[PDB]
């Protein structure tokens, strides 16, 4: 399949070269997979989700996305125009309030919720969780993300936007999940992106166009924007049978575009998420 005039991030993940504008992907498009978006919620009524999104859990007085972050991330996972896996099912877990903050205990509860809730969903091609969130190092937050991974969910987490080593941020520093740094349209490390040995992969993170609340769209930047690219890619590759939840992060790294990014600090992976689709 070919989506012309796609967002640069989508075109990048299906290209060996920066600077193109068509997104190429197998028509399966993540059908039969599920992606949990653990964030401020999802505006599921957005036309861009075509009825494939739904809120499954909230820890606040509403499951609605009163912020936009979560809707934006969900759109990069699986919206018809802005999404990597355009036929995946999106499940929203609102661990962040409408100011975009959430107690660590609430985030942990959301992760354990997903580890169980997947047994309540039909995801014959596999399950993915996208964690576009972070804070200071926490052993407990890391362990919760590790449990989620262990339970058979492909966990992708943002590296963080401190332009620092991600070893000091959670769940970014949990070694068993897929820690995602951010790159820009000129294949440079995003100015803000964390780095370090705990990074597994980079994905498009700067000036990412996706769904917003109020049925709108906007471009925003962050490792929170790169993470759903990788989460969507995982869902897409699982549906193709190329990999599984336990090996998807490794598979994405193995098949990534290698050595193509600039301003990558010594010791950090120079790997850019790539779907290797041969149209």
UniProtKB/Swiss-Prot annotation:
Binding site for Ca(2+) 1: 175, 177, 200
Disulfide bonds: 34-123, 178-249
Source domain of life: Eukaryota
Chain ranges of the Peptidase S8 domain: 7-279
Residues the record marks as active site: 39 (charge relay system), 69 (charge relay system), 224 (charge relay system)
Cofactor binding, note field: Binds 2 calcium ions per subunit.
GO biological process, one term: proteolysis
Catalytic class of the enzyme: hydrolase
Gene Ontology cellular component annotations, sorted alphabetically: extracellular region
EC number: 3.4.21.64
GO molecular function terms attached to this record: metal ion binding; serine-type endopeptidase activity
Cofactor(s), by name: Ca(2+)
Keywords noted in UniProt: Calcium, Disulfide bond, Hydrolase, Metal-binding, Protease, Serine protease, Signal, Zymogen
Family to which this protein belongs: Belongs to the peptidase S8 family.
Function field: Hydrolyzes keratin at aromatic and hydrophobic residues.
Name used for this protein in its record: Proteinase K
Complete-protein stretch covered: 106 to 384 of 384
């Amino acid at each position: 399949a070919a989506q012309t005039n796609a967002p640069w991030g989508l075109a990048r993940i299906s290209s060996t070269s920066p600077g193109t504008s068509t997104y190429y992907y197998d028509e399966s498009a993540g059908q039969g997979s599920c992606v949990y978006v653990i964030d401020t919620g999802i505006e599921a009524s957005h036309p861009e989700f075509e009825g494939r999104a739904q809120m499954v859990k909230t820890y606040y007085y509403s499951s609605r996305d009163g912020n936009g972050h979560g809707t934006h991330c969900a759109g990069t996972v699986g919206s018809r125009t802005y999404g990597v896996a355009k036929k995946t099912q999106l499940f929203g877990v609102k661990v962040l309030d409408d100011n975009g903050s959430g107690q660590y205990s609430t985030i942990i509860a959301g992760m354990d919720f997903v580890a169980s809730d997947k047994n309540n969903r039909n995801c014959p091609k596999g399950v993915v969780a996208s964690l576009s969130l972070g804070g200071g190092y926490s052993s407990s937050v890391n362990s919760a993300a590790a449990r989620l991974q262990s339970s058979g969910v492909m966990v992708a987490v943002a590296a963080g936007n401190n332009n620092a080593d991600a070893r000091n941020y959670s769940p970014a520093s949990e070694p068993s999940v897929c820690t995602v740094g951010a790159s820009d349209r000129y294949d440079r490390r995003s100015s803000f992106s964390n780095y370090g040995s705990v990074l597994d992969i980079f994905g498009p993170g700067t000036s990412i166009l996706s769904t917003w609340i109020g049925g709108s769209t906007r471009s925003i930047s962050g490792t929170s924007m790169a993470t759903p690219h990788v989460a969507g890619l995982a869902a897409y590759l699982m549906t193709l049978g190329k990999t599984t939840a336990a090996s998807a992060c490794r598979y994405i790294a193995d098949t990534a575009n290698k050595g193509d990014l600039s301003n990558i600090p010594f010791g950090t992976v120079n790997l850019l998420a790539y779907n290797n689709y041969q149209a």
